Design an enzyme around this catalytic site. Structure first.
Site, PDB file in Angstrom:
ATOM      1  N   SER A 159     -42.332 -47.232 -90.626  1.00  0.00           N
ATOM      2  CA  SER A 159     -41.672 -46.092 -91.342  1.00  0.00           C
ATOM      3  C   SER A 159     -42.625 -45.636 -92.479  1.00  0.00           C
ATOM      4  O   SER A 159     -43.747 -45.107 -92.169  1.00  0.00           O
ATOM      5  CB  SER A 159     -40.277 -46.472 -91.803  1.00  0.00           C
ATOM      6  OG  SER A 159     -39.733 -45.227 -92.309  1.00  0.00           O
ATOM      7  N   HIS A 261     -33.627 -42.688 -90.324  1.00  0.00           N
ATOM      8  CA  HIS A 261     -34.082 -42.702 -88.902  1.00  0.00           C
ATOM      9  C   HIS A 261     -32.977 -42.321 -87.965  1.00  0.00           C
ATOM     10  O   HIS A 261     -32.735 -42.915 -86.908  1.00  0.00           O
ATOM     11  CB  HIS A 261     -34.751 -44.063 -88.574  1.00  0.00           C
ATOM     12  CG  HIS A 261     -36.018 -44.213 -89.308  1.00  0.00           C
ATOM     13  ND1 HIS A 261     -37.108 -43.418 -88.922  1.00  0.00           N
ATOM     14  CD2 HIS A 261     -36.386 -44.855 -90.432  1.00  0.00           C
ATOM     15  CE1 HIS A 261     -38.110 -43.656 -89.752  1.00  0.00           C
ATOM     16  NE2 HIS A 261     -37.697 -44.507 -90.709  1.00  0.00           N
TER      17      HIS A 261
END
Ligand SMILES: [Cl-]
Length: 384
Positions: A159, A261
């Site tokens: 990420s 996400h």
């Protein structure tokens, strides 16, 4: 420092056995100041082309004797490779090995980590503050790798960490990367349209997708066969938690106030597009296994990839599987990713950049030295 780094080497296994035997003799009883002098002297004398290597991070002389005993036992049984990341002990005859880098993202705390025993909640990370903080520590770890001349085979970032991986790979300079991290944390800290969050499952991707099917929740983070995180609104997450209890799968609520996400991050992705499109991106010059695409970075438009990163899942299982490395070193604060890599059966240790304790910098530098990714551990002794 609270851990010392002790390295040495020799031309082959027989010669390393002899040296290690003598260092073991010399080490019994040394005071802490004497151990630092021995370790600084060994680092000065065992640098360059050092064929067979030992390195250990130790708290004191007795810890050094213990590490030597293990190494000597290993060599006595004809062993040529002992990589114990959780003890900071690394021995390699016949390297170099392949070393990969892991760049962490933000911590993922559990909402109400119990307890008595399960068998006031944690506060979420303040993402506008945490994202640039974590990237500043990662960039300090890249400066340590650069001071050491490290030669890893490739990197991946989880990420947020993909930003630091791209900086390491030469796609963006450190100042632009930190500036982009501040923008990304500001965009991602905006509230979602409705209350949302994340739910960790002790299950694989197919089991997660079966639990989530028809619920509205989606896969947010694929960390491996033992760990998949789903995200959605609170009603959606409650559907999965019901399903998981019926199926006998353990679902753990995480301390976050955003369905990161997931599609609920699309507004944040638009704001990130503005910040990213203003930067002088270059093609990466070193291999990056993307946790957005789950593939090696090739010709990609970094603005498009970093924008769809926010709405799509984190493909850490796939990216980690691409990175062919005998040992992984995490470059950033904490040990989030080394824990995730260990859960996938890989060998990993974190430099723990920016920590109070020198534990990580010693163990991570011992790993780089023994694996042959760096040739000179003297920087650990400079400037104390
Ligand atoms: Cl998938």
């Amino acid at each position: 420092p609270d851990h010392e780094l002790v390295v040495c080497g020799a031309p082959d296994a027989a010669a390393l056995t002899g040296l290690l035997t003598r260092v073991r003799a010399a080490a019994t009883a040394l005071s802490r100041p004497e151990l630092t002098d021995l370790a600084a002297g060994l680092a000065a004398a065992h640098r360059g082309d050092v064929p067979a290597r030992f390195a250990a991070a130790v708290r004191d002389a007795d810890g050094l004797v213990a590490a030597l005993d293990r190494a000597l036992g290993h060599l006595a049984e004809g062993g040529r490779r002992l990589l114990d990341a959780g003890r900071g002990l690394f021995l390699v005859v016949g390297g170099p090995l392949r070393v990969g880098l892991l760049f962490p993202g933000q911590a993922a705390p559990v909402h109400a980590d119990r307890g008595a025993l399960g068998h006031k909640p944690a506060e979420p990370v303040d993402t506008a503050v945490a994202q640039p903080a974590i990237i500043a520590d990662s960039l300090a770890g890249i400066r340590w790798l650069d001071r050491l001349g490290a030669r890893p085979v490739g990197a991946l970032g989880h990420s947020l960490g993909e930003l630091a991986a791209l900086s390491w790979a030469g796609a963006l300079d450190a100042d632009d990367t930190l500036a982009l991290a501040r923008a990304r944390g500001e965009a991602m800290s905006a509230a979602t349209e409705a209350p949302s969050g994340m739910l960790s499952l002790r299950a694989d991707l197919a089991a997660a997708r079966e639990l989530a099917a028809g619920t509205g929740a989606v896969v947010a983070v694929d960390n491996g066969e033992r760990h998949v995180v789903v995200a959605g609104t609170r009603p959606e997450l409650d559907r999965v938690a019901e399903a998981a209890r019926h199926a006998g799968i353990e679902a753990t609520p995480l301390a976050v106030s955003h369905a990161f996400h997931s599609p609920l991050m699309a507004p944040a992705a638009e704001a990130l597009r503005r910040a990213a499109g203003r930067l002088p991106w270059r093609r990466p010059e070193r291999p990056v296994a993307s946790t957005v695409t789950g593939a090696w970075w090739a010709d990609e438009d970094p603005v498009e990839v970093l924008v769809r990163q926010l709405t799509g899942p984190v493909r850490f299982r796939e990216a980690l599987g691409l990175l062919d490395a005998d040992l992984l070193v995490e470059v950033g604060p904490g040990r989030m990713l080394s824990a995730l890599a260990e859960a996938a059966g890989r060998t990993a240790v974190s430099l723990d950049a920016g920590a109070a304790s020198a534990a990580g910098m010693a163990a991570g530098t011992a790993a780089l030295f023994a694996a042959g990714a760096v040739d000179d551990a003297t920087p650990f002794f400079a400037g104390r």
